[PDB]
Amino acid sequence: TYYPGERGPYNNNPSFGASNPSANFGGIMRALNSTNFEQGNVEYIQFWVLDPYVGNGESPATNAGKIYFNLGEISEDVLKDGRKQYENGLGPDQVMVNPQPLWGDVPASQSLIYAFDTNPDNRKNQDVGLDGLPSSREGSIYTNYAGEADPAGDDYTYYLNADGGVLERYKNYNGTEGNSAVSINDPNRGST
Amino acid sequence: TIDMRSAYAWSLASTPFITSINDNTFNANSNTLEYGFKRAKLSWYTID
Amino acid sequence: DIERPITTGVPFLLVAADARAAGLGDQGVATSSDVFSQQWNPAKYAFAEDAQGLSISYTPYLTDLANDISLGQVTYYNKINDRSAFAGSFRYFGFGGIELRQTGDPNEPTREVNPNEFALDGSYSLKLSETFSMAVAARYIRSNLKVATEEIDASAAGSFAVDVAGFYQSEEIAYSDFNGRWRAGFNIQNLGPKISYDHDDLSANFLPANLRVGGGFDFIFDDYNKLGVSLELTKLLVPTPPGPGTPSQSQADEANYKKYKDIGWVSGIFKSFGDAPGGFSEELKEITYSAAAEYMYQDAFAMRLGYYHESPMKGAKQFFSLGAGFKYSMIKVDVSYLFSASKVKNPLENTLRFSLTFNFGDKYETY
Amino acid sequence: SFYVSVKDKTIKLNSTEDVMREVSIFDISGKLLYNNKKVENTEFQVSNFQSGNQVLIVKVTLDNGNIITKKIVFN
């Protein structure tokens, strides 16, 4: 579900509502298990999609656009700064990159295992999203939205913890901040 | 076939180049916060 | 080959769950009363010779491929008077334990799943006359075959069904060369609401409502040699799905499927008789039949032969069955084997069924 | 000793020094979905659409000729 007129995560565009929604992008990426396409003889990308212009909840016919696919070597640096973010390395007692690297905090230590510990206090300090900031310090970086509750726009909401229809309930389900609550009985249940 | 529609396998993408490495359509070549200026909100999920 | 098979939920309910009936071509509606007489005809529990009995049955699947994939059955009956009996049975199909392992060290705590399907039923049989008996059975069916993943919910699907059965067993009748005995029975099975595997009313499957009718004769010579010949007819009480088309091109197919799937189970039972382009001669094509012969020696050794024929247009299950039975003191052992005669690979080929029954309590005289 | 793992619909055979010679993967219908006579203690990619089937049977023939059977869940 794509909202071209709404701000994506970590977007600090001062005039986002004044820009053409058609000029925006919304994108996801994944790694592939078997990387040698020639040896595997991968021939084509196949997909079945429901036509979004036909049935009950159809979009207006004037809402045309494009879906792009990329295959190959794609930058894993989601927040382009040359540094690998990993939030299990964040925390008040952790060493940070000495000048802050333009998207928020980055741990200065070499990562070892991509895993949290099970203490809720460390989890609260660590599960703060890809910007490395716990939404109270996001305004210093994401200045054009410092007045909002979530300046970086990366807050997670469980789909059973939200309101509205099904689409509105998944709107923030991909947020990277707060999506790893320690307890499965949390009202804002994790998703990872 | 190799299935690609596990929603948990997908994560937020880096900003893409559209036509060549010299195309700044979405500010992919930007070294500032402008790199993220054209990212609109996208949700990806399988309905529970 | 198989054209337009009947699609029902929980089809494991129709599998023969005991070696004695399996050896007789998957029929028991009009055989002699036995401990397994709940899947076939609960009404003959009132004709049991022993006061109570317990049985264990094992029907393995894919024996060459894996162990622990089987259909198991436990039956208990208890006839209290000379006219009435209570019976409870438990059929269980399972894949065995499967460990969900994703390497991640060889000491990880692994979840174990046990995909399974079971039906628990209890019946009460009452002898109305001295030769006729009736029974009612209530059954709880639970299907739990799917494994939980992300975006796959493995919640069990359940349903309830009732069975109405009747059994006729005449007294011994002397003939010129032998003193025979006649038997007859009917069983209307699995009458209940549709089972919703995905927990949605729009997507529900008919229970395998089934009608079994059969008759049997017992050739009795020398007062300790018996030759029991039995015949059984079976018809599914579920509407047949639409075939080529019976009102664009796929629009007709979708509309026909829509009108077929919007049929109640009660109305579907009556719509089973018909609902096909053919006439009565082609309506007989939905009938399965089985013929069986059982030779009894001293009532402690049995040899069983049976032929089962499903019309190859539906199901295409055709086979010959061999069975043997041994009674030591109070313990009966039954084994059965299947020789397939159809193109389609029978899952119970090359498989020996095993049944074990214990009879205890008082003994009731037969009329 | 011998353990089979499935991560992303990828099947991985792990044997403690037991060298395997052939792998066969069967559907619960007894259908052969995948046969490989060139096993390399490695990850097989079976076609991901199996018409709602989840349980597979993995049959592994060792060089000595013994057969190891494991039931897995294709997830």
Side-chain angles (χ1 to χ4, degrees):
Chain A
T1 301
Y2 179 50
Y3 310 85
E6 309 207 22
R7 202 169 52 103
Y10 314 115
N11 184 344
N12 198 41
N13 194 346
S15 59
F16 187 86
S19 321
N20 199 334
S22 75
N24 297 325
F25 81 96
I28 49 171
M29 72 188 181
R30 68 166 297 143
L32 307 176
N33 300 314
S34 326
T35 63
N36 191 337
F37 277 28
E38 177 192 51
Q39 183 51 237
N41 193 38
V42 172
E43 288 278 2
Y44 57 93
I45 306 162
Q46 192 185 294
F47 47 97
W48 279 98
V49 280
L50 216 30
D51 194 341
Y53 304 97
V54 166
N56 196 351
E58 83 217 280
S59 32
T62 45
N63 194 31
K66 269 171 107 40
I67 295 178
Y68 285 82
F69 299 82
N70 297 156
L71 291 171
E73 200 62 17
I74 299 138
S75 175
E76 301 189 281
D77 202 2
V78 178
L79 303 193
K80 191 175 110 163
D81 57 358
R83 296 173 162 298
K84 172 169 75 49
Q85 171 73 269
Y86 66 103
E87 55 187 8
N88 61 298
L90 299 162
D93 50 341
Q94 303 308 121
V95 181
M96 297 283 135
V97 180
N98 196 336
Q100 230 189 25
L102 176 98
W103 298 95
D105 278 335
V106 177
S109 319
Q110 171 63 51
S111 60
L112 172 67
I113 294 270
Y114 296 149
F116 297 119
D117 65 63
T118 45
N119 169 47
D121 321 302
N122 309 116
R123 191 70 64 92
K124 174 152 208 53
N125 283 318
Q126 290 171 331
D127 188 25
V128 299
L130 281 171
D131 62 345
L133 295 180
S135 200
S136 290
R137 323 195 255 122
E138 277 168 15
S140 100
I141 301 287
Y142 306 91
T143 58
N144 299 293
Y145 306 92
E148 302 197 347
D150 186 23
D154 64 329
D155 277 6
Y156 163 87
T157 307
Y158 189 44
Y159 51 81
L160 288 200
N161 198 36
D163 254 13
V166 180
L167 264 40
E168 305 95 279
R169 293 196 172 207
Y170 278 97
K171 188 164 198 174
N172 302 106
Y173 187 65
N174 305 109
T176 55
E177 166 159 12
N179 65 332
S180 290
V182 164
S183 162
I184 198 172
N185 292 334
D186 207 87
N188 210 36
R189 187 175 152 142
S191 93
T192 193
Chain B
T1 55
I2 311 148
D3 204 356
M4 288 308 138
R5 62 208 228 282
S6 298
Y8 55 87
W10 295 89
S11 52
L12 196 79
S14 44
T15 303
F17 301 88
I18 208 58
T19 298
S20 52
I21 203 60
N22 303 303
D23 166 85
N24 219 33
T25 289
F26 304 111
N27 313 331
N29 207 25
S30 167
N31 295 304
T32 71
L33 287 186
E34 282 217 340
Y35 163 96
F37 273 15
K38 303 267 186 43
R39 187 197 300 281
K41 193 146 199 47
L42 175 74
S43 48
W44 61 102
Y45 51 92
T46 298
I47 296 169
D48 201 273
Chain C
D1 39 8
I2 309 167
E3 292 115 17
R4 208 37 68 198
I6 299 123
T7 289
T8 70
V10 282
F12 86 99
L13 290 180
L14 300 167
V15 184
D18 64 286
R20 192 220 169 194
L24 295 170
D26 288 17
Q27 84 178 255
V29 79
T31 59
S32 67
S33 158
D34 67 331
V35 73
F36 313 107
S37 90
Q38 176 105 337
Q39 162 169 37
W40 311 102
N41 198 343
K44 44 206 194 95
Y45 275 126
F47 282 88
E49 313 287 275
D50 276 287
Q52 58 202 297
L54 188 79
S55 74
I56 328 296
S57 279
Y58 186 82
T59 302
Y61 279 80
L62 312 155
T63 60
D64 48 320
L65 281 194
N67 276 334
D68 278 67
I69 306 161
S70 75
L71 171 71
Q73 187 186 48
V74 176
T75 312
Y76 172 84
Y77 79 88
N78 187 19
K79 60 175 312 187
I80 43 163
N81 324 331
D82 319 58
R83 318 270 289 178
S84 65
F86 281 102
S89 151
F90 178 71
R91 277 174 291 162
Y92 186 99
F93 175 77
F95 295 149
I98 304 155
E99 82 154 347
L100 300 207
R101 175 171 298 279
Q102 312 167 333
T103 170
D105 266 305
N107 43 281
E108 49 143 340
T110 55
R111 187 174 22 125
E112 214 209 5
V113 301
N114 193 3
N116 70 91
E117 228 168 4
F118 67 85
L120 172 70
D121 46 71
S123 67
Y124 172 75
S125 62
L126 171 72
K127 222 184 290 200
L128 304 186
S129 103
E130 194 103 327
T131 52
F132 182 63
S133 170
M134 296 252 261
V136 280
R139 175 170 301 106
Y140 172 69
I141 311 123
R142 175 181 249 240
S143 187
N144 211 342
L145 292 175
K146 34 187 66 137
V147 182
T149 80
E150 329 74 25
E151 95 271 325
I152 285 175
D153 68 317
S155 288
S159 206
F160 288 88
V162 290
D163 307 67
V164 184
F167 179 67
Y168 166 79
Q169 170 166 302
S170 84
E171 78 286 344
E172 206 160 329
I173 311 144
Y175 295 96
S176 57
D177 320 60
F178 32 66
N179 38 347
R181 178 191 312 266
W182 289 97
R183 261 166 209 122
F186 72 91
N187 194 5
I188 312 151
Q189 288 190 305
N190 314 311
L191 312 173
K194 304 210 212 170
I195 176 154
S196 213
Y197 285 116
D198 301 296
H199 322 283
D200 159 43
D201 264 42
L202 306 136
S203 174
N205 287 98
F206 287 103
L207 286 187
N210 202 41
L211 170 64
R212 309 176 173 283
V213 171
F217 182 79
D218 266 11
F219 297 88
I220 295 143
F221 1 76
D222 298 292
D223 85 86
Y224 50 71
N225 278 29
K226 276 207 324 289
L227 180 57
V229 167
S230 209
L231 187 82
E232 185 164 309
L233 306 174
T234 269
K235 184 189 170 44
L236 270 189
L237 301 179
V238 179
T240 309
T246 52
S248 65
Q249 260 68 56
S250 40
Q251 262 190 359
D253 285 335
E254 311 180 346
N256 283 152
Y257 196 87
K258 199 170 235 213
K259 62 71 208 173
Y260 152 79
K261 76 110 180 182
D262 289 330
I263 295 183
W265 69 274
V266 180
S267 98
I269 286 162
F270 303 98
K271 205 169 315 310
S272 45
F273 303 97
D275 87 89
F280 183 57
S281 298
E282 309 278 18
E283 200 160 358
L284 195 98
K285 198 102 154 283
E286 259 143 44
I287 306 301
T288 79
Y289 71 89
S290 51
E294 184 175 61
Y295 168 71
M296 209 83 217
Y297 184 64
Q298 315 315 45
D299 286 53
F301 174 64
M303 183 67 197
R304 299 166 189 124
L305 182 72
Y307 173 70
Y308 183 86
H309 185 263
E310 208 188 352
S311 143
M313 275 46 269
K314 65 95 144 193
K317 218 159 209 41
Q318 169 180 178
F319 59 84
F320 290 86
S321 54
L322 268 45
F326 313 90
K327 172 219 261 163
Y328 170 45
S329 75
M330 74 141 174
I331 302 193
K332 260 166 271 213
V333 179
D334 298 310
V335 290
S336 73
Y337 195 88
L338 180 144
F339 289 95
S340 176
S342 69
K343 296 309 208 32
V344 184
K345 182 74 220 282
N346 195 308
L348 296 180
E349 277 177 79
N350 301 287
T351 278
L352 201 53
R353 272 149 143 143
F354 183 85
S355 291
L356 183 76
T357 139
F358 308 81
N359 268 308
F360 41 102
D362 281 329
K363 186 140 315 203
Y364 290 93
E365 274 292 348
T366 165
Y367 171 86
Chain D
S1 33
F2 178 86
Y3 83 93
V4 183
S5 57
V6 192
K7 194 46 197 205
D8 298 312
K9 304 263 228 175
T10 302
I11 297 158
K12 176 147 209 24
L13 306 188
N14 326 282
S15 100
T16 325
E17 277 122 38
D18 266 304
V19 152
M20 329 157 258
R21 187 262 292 294
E22 161 171 8
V23 69
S24 271
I25 287 137
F26 295 88
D27 159 358
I28 271 289
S29 73
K31 204 223 308 203
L32 178 70
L33 305 174
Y34 177 87
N35 171 268
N36 191 20
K37 285 141 196 151
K38 324 184 92 132
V39 162
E40 319 142 344
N41 266 260
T42 185
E43 321 204 45
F44 321 109
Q45 252 192 177
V46 190
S47 195
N48 283 183
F49 187 82
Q50 297 291 338
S51 305
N53 293 314
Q54 278 181 307
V55 182
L56 309 180
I57 294 141
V58 183
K59 297 229 97 183
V60 175
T61 310
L62 314 168
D63 259 301
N64 60 30
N66 287 5
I67 291 140
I68 310 165
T69 312
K70 211 70 73 193
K71 264 174 301 208
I72 68 179
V73 171
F74 203 39
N75 288 339

